[PDB]
Amino acid sequence: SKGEELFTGVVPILVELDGDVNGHKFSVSGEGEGDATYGKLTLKFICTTGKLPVPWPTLVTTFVQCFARYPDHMKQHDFFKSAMPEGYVQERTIFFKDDGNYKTRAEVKFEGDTLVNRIELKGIDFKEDGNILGHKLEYNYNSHNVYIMADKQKNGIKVNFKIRHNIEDGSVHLADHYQQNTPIGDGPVLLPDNHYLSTQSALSKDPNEKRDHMVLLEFVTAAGIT
Amino acid sequence: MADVQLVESGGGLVQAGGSLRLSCAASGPTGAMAWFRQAPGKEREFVGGISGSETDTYYVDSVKGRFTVDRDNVKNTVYLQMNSLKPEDTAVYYCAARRRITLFTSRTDYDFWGRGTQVTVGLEV
Lengths: 226, 125
Known about the structure:
By secondary structure, chain A is mostly beta strands. Helices cover 4% and strands 51% of the residues of chain A.
């Protein structure tokens, strides 16, 4: 395919997010590289406006699923790559249990040889001393399955999952993730049979980064049809 | 992508409380550009920089208010104006640049480095 060929090797990634959570405004800039042959993402983000007003883990899902490794027998179900280089719009609502919600719109496209994910985030109705603005979340992440089905109505895909954020008191906070992806261009795209992506994440800190930051490593692989 | 050089000028000797300017010229276009410093026993640490977008500037707390970084995207140059110097600012200062725009502050995130220019605050014969 045309889009698939853009991902045969490692491609650099730029991510830019403008966010407003409960009126608290911030901006985050991140860089890294993706390698869809391994299904691997490596990224580092800094908050350029000072201290991030929400926990870094809550934004992991928001910060380029075109880098998933799709097994050889499944390449015709990879909506993400098939919508490239035109790219896709990724709109999503993340509902935090007994707390506020995020609404996100991202455009993920190629600019030159670099894959860019440009995000807009609006967050509302958050408890000011909740687990989010209260920074009560442990700095870690678990493995999850992302459920994907086609959406012919939009020539796109509908995708859902539930994130499990570990709380510092031993409890867990569920963030119900609903996201929709639609191509911008007019070239044909594959709408896949139902399947899923197994995702694993590891967060860390660069000891030499004086700025509020996060280092994210992800492994993502498609499965679920045989 | 590589083979871009950084040429430092300025610095030198000054009396405590004075002012000195560092300047750095790049052989070609570059992204975020910053200055680091190296005390003789310690190993280089970030002092201040600006992103290639020039939308983000950052200074360490120990320098906030006294130093001013600015850049000329056309001449491919940057400068650091240092005012109200203190004894603890004595060090070898390095110009640094990277291919991409994000103003990271880790030494490891920068792909190009100047030779280093000594700035000594100390008024000692």
